[PDB]
Symmetry: C2
């Protein structure tokens, strides 16, 4: 039951979240391994990538491994550039999303609880990509 | 309450565990930040380092960032060399320790629960460094 795996031996899968662009995940340590309280996932956002800003009743603990990206913070009216070696705590309920420009790629770890109630979008739409069109979202990027 | 910190802005402190050698930790995300279920710590084992092999009723999830070290596995009679990009799940109760030779340095993340009952040593002694003297420990190293 001790598990050792190299990141490259865990398949990178496209994330399921509707409206995410250019984003994959590798479930490095997960419940089938015997994790029963928290899990470890490696995300990678390739150039021109983004996730819809959202919030949820479960905290994030993040460590940026390689590259750089924007941490979109709707309740702070802006986007924070993050880079290697940064640790980020996002408390339950704080809105957040991720973005990369042409040219940027970022790989980062996310620690999550095993219990993860549904996420709520900051921007509500039937087309889950519409946030990229919205002035209230682009204003956060600049 | 969102926290962003670079690793170099979190002080590296010597670990408290008696008999550990050349090992520090940086508490990157911890309970004063608002983490209330799991925490994120960066360990670094400098050359000629080690920790006393132990076991405990709390799992480890590890990601090796830089360098290499031995993961000592007393119940498997050996030591596994680990290196960058490896994810390691150590279930509750599995004995484990860390070692570096002359020449090796390793930096790795550990995710831990906030509740952490006391560790138990594999090798019992009054001098907490005595494990490095013991044939049953050196046999694991080779
Ligand atoms: Ni999230
Ligand atoms: Ni331990």
């Amino acid at each position: 039951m001790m598990k050792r795996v190299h990141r490259t031996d865990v398949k990178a899968e496209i994330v399921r979240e509707p409206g995410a662009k250019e984003t994959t995940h590798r479930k490095l340590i997960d419940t089938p391994d015997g994790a029963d309280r928290f899990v470890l996932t490696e995300f990678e956002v390739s150039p021109n990538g983004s996730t819809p800003p959202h919030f949820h009743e479960w905290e994030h603990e993040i460590y940026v491994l390689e590259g750089s990206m924007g941490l979109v913070l709707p309740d702070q009216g802006r986007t924070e550039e993050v880079g290697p070696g940064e640790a980020i705590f996002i408390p339950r309920g704080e809105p957040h999303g991720f973005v990369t420009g042409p040219g940027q790629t970022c790989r980062f770890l996310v620690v999550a609880p095993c219990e993860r109630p549904p996420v709520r979008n900051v921007f509500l739409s039937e087309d889950p990509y519409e946030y990229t069109q919205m002035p209230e979202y682009t204003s956060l990027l600049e």
